Design a protein around this ligand. Structure first.
Ligand SMILES: *[C@@H]1CC(=O)N(CC)C1=O
Ligand SMILES: *[C@@H]1CC(=O)N(CC)C1=O
Ligand SMILES: [Cl-]
Ligand SMILES: [Cl-]
Ligand SMILES: [Cl-]
Ligand SMILES: [Cl-]
Ligand SMILES: [Cl-]
Ligand SMILES: [Cl-]
Ligand SMILES: [Cl-]
Ligand SMILES: [Cl-]
Ligand SMILES: [Cl-]
Ligand SMILES: [Cl-]
Ligand SMILES: [Cl-]
Ligand SMILES: [Cl-]
Ligand SMILES: [Cl-]
Ligand SMILES: [Cl-]
Ligand SMILES: [K+]
Ligand SMILES: [K+]
Ligand SMILES: [Mg+2]
Ligand SMILES: [Mg+2]
Lengths: 239, 237, 222, 196, 238, 230, 221, 198, 230
């Protein structure tokens, strides 16, 4: 009975409420981020739960600043509120300091907010993990990932959700450092099609966004035509 | 193995679930069925209204929010009015400040942000209400669905409430022809879907059906009683 | 500050904290009220030591010049309610320039008690009160309040330990003959108390203010 | 302007006040009463700014009455005078000062008669006799001239009458009638109005 | 959190306040303390729970507190709670003197503190104060007075009473021996020793006696010196 | 222990469920809406002959055009009645018009579900009372029902309290749209008579009407005797 | 945010168990000794570490010092509060706070944590020494907020044995030099270098910790 | 007071007089009006000495903490922004005219004016009561592409001229050069101060 | 090892006067699976810690347990990562605020004391948990020379000649005791883990009397030490 409150340690020094929130992420479908030569690309396996939904419903890719994208897995309502926290943090930074928030600083700030929800019986931990991606000439490409505990690290490649371990195996095969975003979108599409459990979950939409030199440091959705080319490449690669 | 994990909205279960949110979602399933669908020009809400007895009026299900937005409700009536009031206020605020209607998708975002807050705070509870939102703006007609979980969905068509699963089945079967329907055909599609929720003996009447319509050149309007007769008249058994 | 919901509904529509407050009343000394023709009488059981100062521990208290009350239950809770009512009697004289009606102050006391059954961080008051006095037209009045905040007017009533027995006695004994004179009105109260019982008694007459009877005068009736 | 006067004798206090309520150039009331009964043996006489006078005096009144109901006995005149001063002094530097001048007259069973003078700044002084208003300027010297500590109630009334006649003669305002009251061991007694 | 809340301010199914009753249990295990009213004064007699040989004794008293010019008190229960309450009594007395420029009547001081204790039983969700107090005093209304208050915020006036250890046995002895309206201070003293003789299980180091009298229209509160506490020798003869 | 804002697995608020149960501890109240007006009738339920029947007030005036019958925990209702009275006067002040029966009912029901331990000292629980609002506005005579959940609805005829299920059956049999007010008064008195524990007389019931013609009228003892005679 | 209910409550037998459990933390602490001499007071306590980096014997003012048995971090809180209370007094009265006044105010803080919402009591007992009115003082303050004036006492592990040892070897006429000797011997009963004990003295010249050199000299006796 | 800052290729030069007056009494004749805010960021202070000292101390705190969090040398523009935010927010309570000048690896040598009212502009800049008298001089003398040595001379001359005419300016000339390699400070006193005939 | 009530869930005393929740916080430190070592000499103070990069997809430059608090104060964090970062931010805040208020750099002992005092609060207030982490601070003091300080979740703190934290704390303490600076720290950590490190497998931070500014060694700088020790 040591697992009811985030203000309670178990006898072996664990905080089970945080671990239980992480399980909610593990039950979500997979999102991946890959940092390449000149930017960052995001892809999401977005499960189609109903044919009644519009194509574009329940986006899991967000702009949190003009230069910052965010990819989420877990409880989507919690993720949306974290997107708002991040947006407010980027907004406030510009007001105070007079320039665009560095990605590392934004990650740190939002992570400390996430962490604050792991200490108290008064609130519960966020049931979401997310990736932040950015590009500028001065800072280059950066990709960070934050989990429900509030841990924040930078990555060359990252995956969150139920097929995370399987996604990483595929990502490790890439020499992403040498590749352009154009090549990476195809690889991201590919990896999502590989880790997709076709037997268990039917129907998914592929969601793609990027930020890099090619977008002039602006986080944008991957154009439809490029997205379709990536889908066709991923489909034919899978045989 | 569930007893101690299901009383507080701040308590995660070992399976990575929140039981209070799930229980709140049961509340909308207890509500009577409502259907929403859209064409390229109109968004329509259709709702079944309960009455406890013959001498009682049928409970309202469709509410005006702004000239361009209306809602249908399923679940706790009190939560529905609390949310309706918030929505009305947001629309007023937008027109006051910007002198233009609040885009429908922006309002839904505001709802999701608002309804998420009590899901993370001790001693608070989720909103036990689901909404179908019909709107028209610069991006055309819209049907949104909001959940006690504070999640929201952009829909081609949707149904929530009791026995709504069979309304959803109808909608999927016919949704390929919704976009090209005129208003009359679109409402009939909504009525047919809602009729699927009824027991085999029960029928749509002017007492139990409520219709809301918003479109390109029509402000959100609610049709009740004698006003729903034109829509029912051309329906095949 | 402390915001726990203390008084809550239980499965049969019961408010347990209020019912428990009513149990605290039953542990209290018996108090009897009788409304006469031109008199109102309160009588209370006193359980007392020989070494005790009688003046300090009284269960009959004046709220205003024209209103007094008796109580049964938690004596500390009673002191709080009495002093709240005393403040309210003065606020009324201030704002309306008239003395309070017996009904007005009853209504006030009752709504105070009701609030403590629906407020966070508080338990209900564990007292019932009998409130007596006269109105402007010289009509005698007797009201009862209880922890739930319900109030009613009575011809005669009892509260506290063995209130049910005393009530059943008064039902059979409250007639025109019993309240025909002032002596028989006081007697009926003493008889009502002697049914479960060392007694304190007070009388209030039309525009004459509260008069507490001497132990020698009470010994004459017993 | 409003006039107040008090005269303390051996076992009584005599008090009087004008009965005019003025507004601009007119008398609006000629039977005004400026005396407030605090308890059975205490009178508070209050003059000054409109609104402030009745608000303050009635506040003290209800509080003195509440004390009696809570405790079963009354405030002594001295306790009531200090209570009054505390309240007025506390409000002096607040958002709600009261521009009132007061006499408090009372009889205590153990202390005998008492008369207290208080100005709007809330300075309190015990006096054998005192007066408020512009009328005080014309009457205080008559009191100084004729008063003795052993003055009888009969003489006090005639000495009051001398002061009031001086106002008729010499004072520029029309003050034709006065409330007169006396406090002793038997409580507050209404005497006849002194009229011109 | 509703899980960890012990709910100190609720009714039991019988209409009882458990915390109040458990507090009164604590008091019954505290040092014996009794007060006796007489025609020419009041006294407090307390059992010292100090008792250790290596204690320093820096104050004029250990269990008897002066409250104002005309009042003292003694306590049974949690010592630390008593310190909070006695400080508060001094504040109330001073607040009254500021306002009225006369000393607070004894009953008014008792009522004011009891209102604080009552509040702790009704709201705030805190534990009550585990203190019973005996108050002695003189005022111009009722002269010499003795009061007792308990954790619920109930009080009463007494001609003689006892709180703390073996108080039931003490109250029995008082009923037998106390001559109502005929007690002097010298005979009250005698009765106090006699009562403490039976209830305590007597030395001058083990007791503390304070008297309150009137001299030249002024209240005198004095704690008897060890030499005067001659009173133990005067009893053993009887 | 659980919080006041806990959902059951069936998606119901426990406290609201329990508050609705408390209505069944209440005495029977009846309302009938006709084209000639609305009538309200309530069982007083005298518990002792020593109690003054006139001190039991279960029909109250909200405004000149609106009455209110209550059932359940009567002490809870007083604060709801005050809110209704104040709100009608607030509406008059601002708009210089009478507030509709529906609008009054709506305003009172806004209070419901506004409970919870999150200040400080706000409502800790729902109100354990049901209300019948009967009055006349520009839409004609109207009767509304509101329960502890804050749900309100227009009713042709409604019974609340312990014997409401049986009384509602009787109402559905006797009620018709063209029914006069005098019939409605007699109908509800006949129904109250059969569902009451005590024998119906002129002292143990209350009756009030609101008509397009005249203001809220509480029936006097003599007026009740006339209606019973039949 | 914070809990508003007490975590210390009365048990059916009238006990406050949290306070008793707090005293169990004290009794499990390292031993401390206080001895009031005729012309001073001495406080003594048992302690890769840098022993000079943290101290158990601590000045509050120029004339008041303190030591503890129990939980070190809880002690630091009370040290900070005591220092603060002493300054608040000085600002008003422009006079060093009497030892007894300091003890009373600190004990009052300790009482708060037995009643206030969402907190546990302190798991420390204090020994406070001071010099004012040309007279030495020694006080103890327990987790409940109760305080006692002692001629000599011990707290922590083996305090029961320490107290009877002192009862045998302490007289009132003993001066400060001798009091230090007997205080060290009291710790020696349940134990030694000048690095593992701390000693503070208090006389007319005020309160100071004995230097490691000074302690080394007393150990030579 | 006269304050001034000039950008060159690879850094900035700052300068100020040293006179602090109460009315027409010189309370401090050797004031230091060039305050370091970070390793390579300075501000020149004019207006209320209370206000500019308080604002400078506050910004130093803010920029120092910010710099640790980011683990990088701060931008001059960031320092200027922090001054602007405070000077604008409390414009009704402040009497402060600031010049912010320094070097960062991103933008090099930069000069920002934050005048009374709390607007912010990149510019060379002059401020203080004494600056009125040298507007014509600086407008006539300034040349694009000046070396560091020329900027020092330009600043020394301009300040000297202002110091002669403005009773509220005078004393010594404090100069600072800021570049990648660091900060170089010097004082011109007596004969070292440029002289012009009457 | 007895228990009563909620003494294992919140920081109240157990029957023997223990705080179980505090003890569990020490267990939490070991969940990281890392060990850190700090040693001071006359000339410098050094911190060495393990750097485990299991993934490869991690940007290893962002994987660190060494933190600059001020220019002149560095620290190593052992335990829960997010808890650690939070305590680092607080230390940075306290240090910046000290400089602002007092006009000189915070002493290492004072910063450590402050963090420890903050941690004490979490051991006394029931509503939050202690942080499952451990902080070791290094810096040069003007008078005392190089300093090494450590504070724990219990709110204890101390200065050391040398110390360790994490999984092999006890084994490291044994090693360091037997020895009584950069070479010592690396050797100690290599012995208790039985590894023998690559330059990428450890992190090293230094402050010296000649160079007070906290410095993190590069991979090449670490290698020159590992090659010399070989
Ligand atoms: C949210 C999504 C869903 O299926 N429901 C029930 C109809 C919601 O309210
Ligand atoms: C902190 C570290 C140390 O050596 N001490 C004394 C034993 C502390 O309390
Ligand atoms: Cl959902
Ligand atoms: Cl549904
Ligand atoms: Cl009146
Ligand atoms: Cl009863
Ligand atoms: Cl005093
Ligand atoms: Cl019902
Ligand atoms: Cl709480
Ligand atoms: Cl400190
Ligand atoms: Cl020292
Ligand atoms: Cl700073
Ligand atoms: Cl300017
Ligand atoms: Cl300027
Ligand atoms: Cl200037
Ligand atoms: Cl100069
Ligand atoms: K000059
Ligand atoms: K804690
Ligand atoms: Mg005014
Ligand atoms: Mg200024």
């Amino acid at each position: 009975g040591y697992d009811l409150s985030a203000s309670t340690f178990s006898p072996d020094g664990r905080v089970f409420q945080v671990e239980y929130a992480m399980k909610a992420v593990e039950n979500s479908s997979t999102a991946i981020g890959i940092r390449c030569k000149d930017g960052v690309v995001f892809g999401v396996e977005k499960l189609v739960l109903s044919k009644l939904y519009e194509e574009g419903s329940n986006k899991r890719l967000f702009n949190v600043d003009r230069h910052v994208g965010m990819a989420v897995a877990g409880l989507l309502a919690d993720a949306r509120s974290l997107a708002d926290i991040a947006r407010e943090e980027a907004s406030n930074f510009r007001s105070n300091f007079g320039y665009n928030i560095p990605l590392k600083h934004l990650a740190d700030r939002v992570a400390m907010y996430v962490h604050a929800y792991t200490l108290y019986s008064a609130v519960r931990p966020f049931g979401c993990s997310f990736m932040l991606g950015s590009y500028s000439v001065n800072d280059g490409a950066q990709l960070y990932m934050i989990d429900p505990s509030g841990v924040s690290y930078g990555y060359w490649g990252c995956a969150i959700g139920k097929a995370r371990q399987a996604a990483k195996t595929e990502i490790e095969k890439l020499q992403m450092k040498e590749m352009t975003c154009r090549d990476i979108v195809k690889e991201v599409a590919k990896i999502i099609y590989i880790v997709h459990d076709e037997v268990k979950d039917k129907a998914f939409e592929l969601e793609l966004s990027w930020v890099g030199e090619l977008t002039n440091g602006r986080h944008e959705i991957v154009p439809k035509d490029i997205r379709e080319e990536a889908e066709k490449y991923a489909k034919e690669s899978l045989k | 193995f569930r007893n101690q994990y299901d009383n507080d909205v701040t308590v995660w279960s070992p399976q990575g679930r929140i039981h209070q949110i799930e229980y709140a979602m049961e509340a909308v399933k207890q509500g009577s069925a409502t259907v929403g669908l859209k064409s390229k020009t109109h968004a329509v809400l259709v709702a079944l209204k309960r009455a406890q007895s013959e001498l009682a009026a049928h409970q309202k299900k469709i509410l005006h929010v702004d000239n361009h937005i209306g809602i249908s409700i399923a679940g706790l009536t009190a939560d529905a009015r609390l949310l309706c009031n918030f929505m009305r206020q947001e629309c007023l605020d937008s027109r006051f400040v910007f002198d233009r209607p609040l885009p429908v998708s922006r309002l839904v975002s505001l709802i999701g942000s608002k309804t998420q807050i009590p899901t993370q705070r001790y001693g608070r509870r989720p909103y036990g209400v689901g909404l179908l939102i019909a709107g028209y703006d610069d991006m055309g007609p819209h049907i949104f669905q909001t959940c006690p979980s504070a999640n929201y969905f952009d829909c081609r068509a949707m149904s929530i409430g009791a026995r709504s699963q069979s309304a959803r089945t109808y909608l999927e079967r016919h949704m390929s022809e919704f976009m090209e329907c005129n208003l009359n055909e679109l409402v009939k599609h909504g009525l047919r879907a809602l009729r699927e929720t009824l027991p085999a003996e029960q029928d749509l009447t002017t007492k139990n059906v409520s219709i809301g319509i918003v479109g390109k050149d029509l402000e959100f309007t609610i049709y009740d009683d004698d006003d729903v007769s034109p829509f029912l008249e051309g329906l095949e058994e | 500050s402390y915001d726990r919901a203390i008084t809550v509904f239980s499965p049969d529509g019961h408010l347990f904290q209020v019912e428990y407050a009513q149990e605290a009343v039953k542990k209290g000394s018996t108090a009897v009220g009788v409304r006469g023709r031109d008199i109102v009488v309160l009588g209370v059981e006193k359980k007392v030591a020989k070494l005790q100062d009688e003046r300090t521990v009284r269960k009959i208290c004046a709220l205003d010049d024209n209103v007094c009350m008796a109580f049964a239950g938690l004596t500390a809770d009673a002191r709080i309610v009495i002093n709240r009512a005393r403040v309210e009697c003065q606020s009324h004289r201030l704002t309306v320039e008239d003395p309070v009606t017996v009904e007005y102050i009853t209504r006030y006391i009752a709504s105070l008690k009701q609030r403590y059954t629906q407020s966070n961080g508080r338990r209900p008051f564990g007292i019932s009160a009998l409130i007596v006095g006269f109105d402007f037209d010289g009509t005698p009045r007797l009201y009862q309040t209880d922890p739930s905040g319900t109030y009613h007017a009575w011809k005669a009533n009892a509260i506290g330990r063995g209130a049910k027995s005393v009530r059943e006695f008064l039902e059979k004994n409250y007639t025109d003959e019993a309240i025909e004179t002032d002596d028989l009105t006081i007697k009926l109260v003493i008889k009502a108390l002697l049914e479960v019982v060392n007694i304190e008694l007070a009388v209030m007459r039309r525009d004459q203010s509260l008069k507490i009877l001497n132990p020698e005068e009470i010994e004459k009736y017993v | 302007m409003e006039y107040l006067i008090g005269i303390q004798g051996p076992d009584y206090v005599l008090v009087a006040s004008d009965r005019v309520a003025a507004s601009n150039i007119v008398q609006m009331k000629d039977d005004h009463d400026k005396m407030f009964k605090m308890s059975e043996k205490i009178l508070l006489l209050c003059v000054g700014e409109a609104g402030d006078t009745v608000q303050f005096a009635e506040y003290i009144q209800k509080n003195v009455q509440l004390y009696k109901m809570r405790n079963g006995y009354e405030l002594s005149p001295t306790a009531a005078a200090n209570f009054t001063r505390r309240n007025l002094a506390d409000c002096l530097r607040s958002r709600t000062p009261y521009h009132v001048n007061l006499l408090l007259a009372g009889y205590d069973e153990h202390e005998g008669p008492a008369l207290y003078y208080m100005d709007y700044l809330a300075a309190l002084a015990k006096a054998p006799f005192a007066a408020h208003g512009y009328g005080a300027f014309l009457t205080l010297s008559i009191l100084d001239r004729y008063y003795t500590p052993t003055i009888s109630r009969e003489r006090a009334v005639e000495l009051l009458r001398k002061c009031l006649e001086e106002l008729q003669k010499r004072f520029i305002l029309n003050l034709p009638t006065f409330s007169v009251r006396i406090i002793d061991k038997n409580g507050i007694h209404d005497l006849d109005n002194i009229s011109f | 959190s509703r899980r960890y809340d012990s709910r100190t301010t609720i009714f039991s199914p019988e209409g009882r306040l458990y915390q109040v009753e458990y507090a009164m249990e604590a008091i019954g295990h505290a040092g014996t303390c009794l007060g006796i009213l007489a025609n020419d004064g009041v006294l407090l007699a307390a059992e010292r729970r100090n008792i250790h040989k290596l204690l320093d004794e820096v104050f004029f008293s250990e269990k008897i507190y002066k409250l104002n010019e005309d009042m003292a008190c003694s306590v049974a229960g949690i010592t630390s709670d008593a310190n909070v309450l006695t400080n508060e009594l001094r504040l109330i007395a001073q607040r009254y003197l500021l306002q009225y420029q006369e000393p607070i009547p004894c009953e008014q001081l008792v009522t004011a503190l009891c209102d604080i204790k009552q509040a702790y039983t009704q709201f705030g969700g805190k534990r009550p104060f585990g203190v019973s107090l005996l108050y002695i005093g003189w005022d111009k209304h009722y002269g010499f007075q003795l009061y007792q208050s308990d954790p619920s915020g109930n009080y009463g006036g007494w001609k003689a009473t006892c709180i703390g250890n073996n108080s039931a046995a003490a109250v029995s002895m008082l009923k037998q021996d106390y001559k109502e309206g005929e007690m002097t201070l010298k005979s009250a003293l005698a009765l106090a020793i006699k009562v403490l003789n039976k209830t305590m299980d007597l030395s001058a180091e083990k007791v503390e006696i304070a008297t309150l009298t009137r001299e030249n229209g002024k209240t005198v509160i004095r704690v008897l010196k060890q030499k005067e506490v001659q009173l133990i020798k005067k009893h053993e003869e009887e | 222990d659980r919080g006041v804002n806990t959902f059951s697995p069936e998606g119901r608020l426990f406290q609201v469920e329990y508050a609705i149960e408390a209505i069944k501890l209440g005495s029977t109240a009846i309302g009938i809406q006709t084209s000639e007006g609305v009538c309200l009738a309530v069982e007083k339920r005298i518990t002792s002959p020593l109690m003054e029947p006139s001190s039991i007030e279960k029909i109250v005036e909200i405004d000149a055009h609106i009455g209110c019958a209550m059932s359940g925990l009567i002490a809870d209702a007083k604060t709801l009645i005050d809110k209704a009275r104040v709100e009608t006067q607030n509406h008059w002040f601002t708009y210089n018009e009478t507030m509709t029966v529906e609008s009054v009912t709506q305003a009172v029901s806004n209070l419901a579900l506004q409970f919870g331990e999150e200040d400080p000292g706000a409502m800790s629980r729902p109100f354990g009372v049901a209300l019948l609002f009967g009055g006349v506005d520009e839409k004609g005579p109207q009767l509304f029902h509101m329960d502890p959940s804050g749900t309100f609805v227009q009713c042709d005829a409604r019974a609340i309290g312990s014997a409401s299920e049986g009384a509602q059956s009787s109402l559905q049999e006797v009620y018709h749209k063209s029914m006069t007010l005098k019939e409605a008064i007699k109908s509800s008195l006949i129904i109250l008579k059969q569902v009451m524990e005590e024998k119906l007389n002129a002292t143990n019931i209350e009756l009030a009407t609101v008509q397009p013609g005249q203001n809220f009228h509480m029936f006097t003892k003599e007026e009740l005797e006339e209606v019973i005679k039949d | 945010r914070g809990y508003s209910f007490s975590l210390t409550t009365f048990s059916p037998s009238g006990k406050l168990v949290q306070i008793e459990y707090a005293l169990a933390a004290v009794a499990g602490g390292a031993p401390s000794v206080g001895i009031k001499a005729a012309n001073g007071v001495v406080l003594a306590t048992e302690k890769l570490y840098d022993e000079r980096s943290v101290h158990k014997v601590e000045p509050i003012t120029k004339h008041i010092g303190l030591v503890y048995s129990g939980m070190g971090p809880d002690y630091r809180v009370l040290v900070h509060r005591a220092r603060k209370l002493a300054q608040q007094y000085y600002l008003v009265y422009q006079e060093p706070i009497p030892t007894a006044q300091l003890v009373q105010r600190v004990a009052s803080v300790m009482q708060e944590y037995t009643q206030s919402g969402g907190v546990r009591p302190f798991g420390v007992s204090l020994l406070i020494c001071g010099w004012n009115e040309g007279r030495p003082y020694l006080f103890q303050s327990d987790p409940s907020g109760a305080y006692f004036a002692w001629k000599a006492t011990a707290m922590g592990k083996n305090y029961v044995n320490g107290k009877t040892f002192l009862e045998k070897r302490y007289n009132e006429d003993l001066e400060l030099e001798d009091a230090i000797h007997t205080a060290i011997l009291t710790l020696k009963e349940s134990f030694m270098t000048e690095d593992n004990i701390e000693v503070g003295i208090c006389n007319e010249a005020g309160f100071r910790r004995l230097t490691p050199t000074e302690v080394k000299d007393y150990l030579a006796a | 007071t006269t304050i001034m800052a000039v950008q060159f290729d690879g850094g900035v030069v700052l300068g100020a007089d040293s006179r602090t007056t109460t009315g027409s009494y010189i309370a401090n004749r050797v004031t230091d009006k060039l305050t370091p805010i970070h390793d390579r960021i300075f501000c020149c202070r004019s207006g209320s000495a209370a206000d500019t000292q308080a604002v400078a101390d506050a910004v130093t705190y803010q920029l120092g903490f910010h710099s640790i969090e980011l683990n990088e040398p701060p931008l001059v523009h960031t320092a200027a922004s922090l001054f602007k935010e405070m000077c604008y927010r409390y414009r009704e309570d402040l009497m402060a005219g600031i010049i912010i000048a320094g070097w960062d690896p991103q933008e090099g040598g930069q000069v920002y004016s934050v005048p009374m009212g709390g607007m912010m502009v990149r510019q060379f800049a002059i401020g203080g009561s004494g600056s009125s008298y040298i507007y014509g001089y600086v407008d006539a003398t300034y040349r694009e592409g000046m070396t560091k040595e020329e900027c020092l001379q330009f600043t020394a001359n301009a300040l000297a001229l202002a110091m002669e005419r403005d009773g509220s300016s005078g004393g010594v000339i404090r100069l600072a050069a800021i570049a990648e390699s660091g900060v170089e400070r010097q004082v011109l006193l007596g004969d070292q101060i440029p002289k012009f005939a009457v | 090892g007895s228990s009563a009530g909620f003494d294992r869930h919140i920081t109240i005393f157990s029957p023997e006067g223990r705080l179980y929740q505090v003890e569990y916080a020490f267990k939490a430190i070991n969940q990281g699976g890392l060990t850190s070592v700090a040693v001071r000499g006359k000339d410098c103070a050094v911190i060495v810690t393990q750097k485990k990069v299991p993934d490869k997809l991690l940007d290893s430059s962002t994987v660190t347990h060494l933190f600059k608090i001020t220019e002149n104060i560095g620290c190593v964090m052992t335990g829960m990562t997010a808890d650690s970062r939070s305590q680092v931010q607080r230390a940075r805040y306290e240090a910046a605020n000290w400089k602002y208020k007092y006009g000189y750099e915070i002493p290492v002992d004072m910063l450590c004391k402050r963090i420890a005092d903050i941690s004490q609060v979490y051991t006394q207030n029931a509503e939050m948990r202690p942080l499952g982490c451990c902080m070791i601070l290094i810096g040069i003091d003007e008078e005392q020379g190089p300093q090494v300080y450590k504070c724990d979740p219990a709110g204890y703190y101390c200065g050391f000649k040398a110390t360790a934290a994490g999984v092999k704390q006890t084994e490291s303490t044994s090693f360091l005791e037997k020895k009584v600076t950069v070479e010592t720290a690396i050797t100690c950590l290599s012995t208790v883990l039985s590894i023998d490190f690559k330059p990428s497998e450890i992190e090293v931070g230094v402050v010296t009397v000649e160079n007070p500014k906290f410095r993190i060694l590069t991979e090449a700088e670490i290698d020159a030490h590992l090659v010399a020790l070989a």
